[PDB]
A paper describes a structure:
Iron and manganese are essential nutrients whose transport across membranes is catalyzed by members of the [name] family. In humans, this protein family contains two paralogs, the ubiquitously expressed [name], which is involved in the uptake and distribution of Fe2+ and Mn2+, and [name], which participates in the resistance against infections and nutrient recycling. We show that both proteins catalyze selective metal ion transport coupled to the symport of H+, but additionally also mediate uncoupled H+ flux. Their structures, while sharing general properties with known prokaryotic homologs, display distinct features that lead to stronger transition metal ion selectivity.
Author numbering:
A (entry chain B): 1 to 120
B (entry chain A): 92 to 562
């Protein structure tokens, strides 16, 4: 039932800007935490940022603070990233993940389809 | 006899006043915040706060029935003179604090009900009739008031039950929120609201009410068969009364989290224009989040579900305002009776509390606007939060010593549970006090703030040390 589609892939020169979107349906994403990932080629998946939305707080990783911004539209049931000043190390497969606790002691992870972003 | 409805009925009455004592407008506002800040996720803490509060109530009932003196009177006989009086003023500040957020609650209710015709300061001056009422009861001296509490609960449940039916929230979310504690990705402000709710639930002076109310009932202290049954039935009455209050509290949280969670200001403005309610310009036109208070929350609720819901919400707040006042004077009358042994009628207590409370509240209403008027509720909420523990250390410190409780002392697990609880609440307060000090960062204004913080920590640590010897 959980569905996530990422839109906003492509080629952008270093120092550019672009906006990525995760569109999801089948569940009330407004009430659930939203996490964001990137898988660089040859490296492991890494925690970028997440809008837990328990207080609309936004948390960023160390290599992300001050460079990328996040937003969400629960009316469209979608989440937006605005990335500015893209550096060549930002090259990675970008993925959208929902952490539904299941109201149990174990969580379940659902990933999107994956969009590739290139920086020169 | 394991249990009997006949004995229940014969030993009821403390629950009626206790129930309404748990739904002051501060608690409704506290439950209001989770409806639009954290949604259903932060609902389990409400059950934890009530469950701990009920466990504290049983200790108040134990102390009240084991020895005839209530907890205030036994406080006069235990601590030295300086700790007694300084604690006396500390608990008093809660009553003025409790009465302060009530008059904001009542004044806001008048303003919404009067479609803005009666001004804000009109609402602040409209609660003087409450003082006039208390004088009239004192002249008549009914002194029963049980029907007032029963009716007041009845209108509260009917009003908020209508809200729950009208909203029709998903029972899956509230069940999943209440019975499965989950709270992730939160920073200091979020836990600040979390400690605000638990502080708002466990009001410090409710221990004095139960101790005094239990003392009113007659029971042979020397004979052990009467005290055990009286303790059991009083505890079961507290369980029923607390369950009803918590059910009403979960009604409000579920109402405000179903439809007012994650809604931007544009959407609520759009529906307000569609309904054509005049109260529409309050919400600014921007992408930012929604902030809720008693004034704003009632307005958007009225916009979304007709003026009928707004008026019922306004009536419900007024019932909360009356409940907080009635438990306010009852608390104040008993503590002054016990601590320094001063006999004052209820009219004296309400006059003292109300006259002190309205002095700043009317002034800020004249100077600052309504948004800052509910902004002051934040200051009262946090002030009540730091002084929340003052209902914890005294109750077990006194219901732990063998000479005072005879051989009805708490079991070992209760002592260790209280010791863990007081350490947890001490650590939380010391964690928060240093953060609040760092917020200002002045040269001498930080000095007076540091002096106050030093004094409060010293008082708290001394009480904690006294508890450790007691345990």
């Amino acid at each position: 039932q959980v569905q996530l589609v990422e839109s906003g892939g492509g080629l952008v020169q270093a120092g550019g800007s672009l906006r990525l979107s995760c569109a999801a349906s089948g569940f009330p994403v407004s009430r659930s935490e939203m996490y964001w990932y990137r898988q660089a080629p040859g490296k492991e998946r890494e925690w970028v940022a997440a809008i837990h939305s328990i207080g609309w707080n936004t948390r960023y990783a160390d290599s992300v603070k001050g460079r990328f911004t996040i937003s969400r539209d629960n009316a469209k049931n979608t989440v937006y990233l605005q990335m500015n000043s893209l550096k060549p190390e930002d090259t990675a497969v970008y993925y959208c993940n929902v952490k539904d606790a299941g109201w149990f002691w174990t969580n379940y992870d659902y990933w999107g389809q994956g969009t590739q972003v290139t920086v020169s | 006899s394991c249990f009997s409805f006949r004995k229940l009925w014969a030993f009821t009455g403390p629950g009626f006043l206790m129930s309404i004592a748990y739904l002051d407008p501060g608690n409704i506002e506290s439950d209001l915040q989770s409806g639009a800040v954290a949604g259903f996720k932060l609902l389990w803490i409400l059950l934890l706060a009530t469950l701990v509060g009920l466990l504290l109530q049983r200790l108040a009932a134990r102390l009240g029935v084991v020895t005839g003196l209530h907890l205030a009177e036994v406080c006069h006989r235990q601590y030295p003179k300086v700790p007694r009086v300084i604690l006396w003023l500390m608990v008093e500040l809660a009553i003025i604090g409790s009465d302060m957020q009530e008059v904001i609650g009542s004044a806001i209710a008048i303003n919404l009900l009067s479609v803005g015709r009666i001004p804000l300061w009109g609402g602040v001056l409209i609660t003087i009739a409450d003082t006039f009422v208390f004088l009239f009861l004192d002249k008549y001296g009914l002194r029963k008031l049980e029907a007032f509490f029963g009716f007041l609960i009845t209108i509260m449940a009917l009003t908020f039950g209508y809200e729950y039916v009208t909203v029709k929230p998903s029972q899956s979310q509230v069940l999943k929120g209440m019975f499965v504690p989950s709270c992730s990705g939160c920073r200091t402000p979020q836990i600040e609201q979390a400690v605000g709710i638990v502080g708002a639930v466990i009001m410090p002076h409710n221990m004095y009410l139960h101790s005094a109310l239990v003392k009113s009932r007659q029971v042979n202290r020397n004979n052990k068969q009467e005290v055990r049954e009286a303790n059991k039935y009083f505890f079961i009455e507290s369980c029923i009364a607390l369950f009803v209050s918590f059910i009403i509290n979960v009604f409000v949280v579920s109402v405000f989290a179903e439809a007012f969670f994650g809604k931007t200001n544009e959407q609520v403005v759009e529906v307000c224009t569609n309904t054509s309610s005049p109260h529409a310009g309050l919400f600014p036109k921007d992408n930012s989040t929604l902030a809720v208070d008693i004034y704003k929350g009632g307005v958007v609720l009225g916009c979304y579900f007709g003026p009928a819901a707004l008026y019922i919400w306004a009536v419900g707040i007024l019932a909360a305002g009356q409940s907080s006042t009635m438990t306010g004077t009852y608390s104040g009358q008993f503590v002054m009776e016990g601590f320094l042994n001063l006999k004052w009628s209820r009219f004296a207590r309400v006059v003292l509390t109300r006259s002190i409370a309205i002095i700043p509240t009317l002034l800020v209403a004249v100077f600052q606007d309504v948004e800052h008027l509910t902004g002051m509720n934040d200051f009262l909420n946090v002030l009540q939060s730091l002084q929340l523990p003052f209902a914890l250390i005294p109750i077990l410190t006194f219901t732990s010593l063998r000479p005072v409780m005879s051989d009805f002392a708490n079991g070992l697990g209760w002592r260790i549970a209280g010791g863990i609880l007081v350490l947890i609440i001490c650590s939380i307060n010391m964690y928060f006090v240093v953060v609040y000090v760092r917020d200002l960062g002045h040269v001498a204004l930080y000095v007076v703030a540091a002096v106050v913080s030093v004094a409060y920590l010293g008082f708290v640590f001394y009480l904690g040390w006294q508890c450790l010897i007691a345990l």
